[PDB]
Amino acid sequence: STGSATTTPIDSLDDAYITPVQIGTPAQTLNLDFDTGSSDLWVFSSETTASEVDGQTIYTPSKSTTAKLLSGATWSISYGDGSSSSGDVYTDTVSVGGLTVTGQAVESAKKVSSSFTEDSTIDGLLGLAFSTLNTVSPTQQKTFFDNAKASLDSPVFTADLGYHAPGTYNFGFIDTTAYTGSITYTAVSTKQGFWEWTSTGYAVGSGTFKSTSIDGIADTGTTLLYLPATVVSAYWAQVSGAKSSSSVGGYVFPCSATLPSFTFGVGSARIVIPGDYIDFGPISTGSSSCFGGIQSSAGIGINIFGDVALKAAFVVFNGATTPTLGFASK
Ligand SMILES: NCc1cccc(N)c1
Secondary structure, three states, rough: OOOOEEEEEEEOOOOOOOEEEEEEOOOEEEEEEEOOOOOOEEEEEEEOOOHOOOOOOOHHHHHOOOOOEEEEEEEEOOOOOEEEEEEEEEEEEEEEEOEEEEEEEEEEEEEEEEHHHHHOOOEEEEOOOOHHHOOOOOOOOOOOOHHHHHHHOOEEEEEOOOOOOOEEEEEOOOOOOOOOOOOOOEEOOOOOOOOOOEEEEEOOOOOEEEEEEEEEEEOOOOOOOEEEEHHHHHOOOOOOOEEOOOOOOEEEEEOOOOOOOOOEEOOEEEEEEEEHHEEEEOOOOOOOEEOEEEEEOOOOOOOOHHHHHOOOOOEEEOOOOEEEEEEEEO
């Protein structure tokens, strides 16, 4: 089998992407944030504290003839931005772009933190990291990809995120019309539960490529590109007036600037992020200070190839017995 679904930016900055997902019988369609940096499929629901729902579409398990309470199971998750959610668990039928999994763990939120409430466009998350990170207790649950894998034509999914435009998540096949050139594959460590790999270096604008190993994760659920302070300083030094602001929480730059591109290495290959992808707009409405899309990972403990980087590529998440990542230009 295969599946194919369009993923759409939630706003004009590409702050996140939502993909429609059918849950239950009859189908209830929720718009979920596919997140290769976490491993829980959780949704706003009829069980979510009413004051914490503000415009999201909810899953109502009592209206699904295929929903079954997973007795005793609870979940609780915290993300790198300080947000969190928790609740109980149902199993139900879940379909993405025509690909159906029966018996998928659907984690129903009883509580969500303020950032989730305040974002009416995201009805939940669909985790696509390794199932070892799934938070369900006392019986850990499998991701949608792990459950679908055996049925797929090939044990892969691909992320093709758009810049200020819709893109595609495919399951079970590689669309050879969706990228240019060849796909370069690189090794993955699953030791921390992430799609963790080592970039071979970087360049800023038209500058020379610096060969240096940068271990990080491919994370569709993180907006920006978080890299070591040395690398990030070298980038922003090429932008007149750019500076790191403690009060704002990262590098800012004059909105009148034209940003240089940023290149990262995948083996001997190179992915070029155009400068415009690095512009996240005014720090507050009407400001002439703009927020940068490349930020330091120093306070995080890990480097993160988030959407800023991934949207410049066609990305293969290869879930073969030994997982690997593939990157192509597009
Ligand atoms: N990085 C996971 C994620 C995705 C969407 C929203 C939040 N708060 C967190």
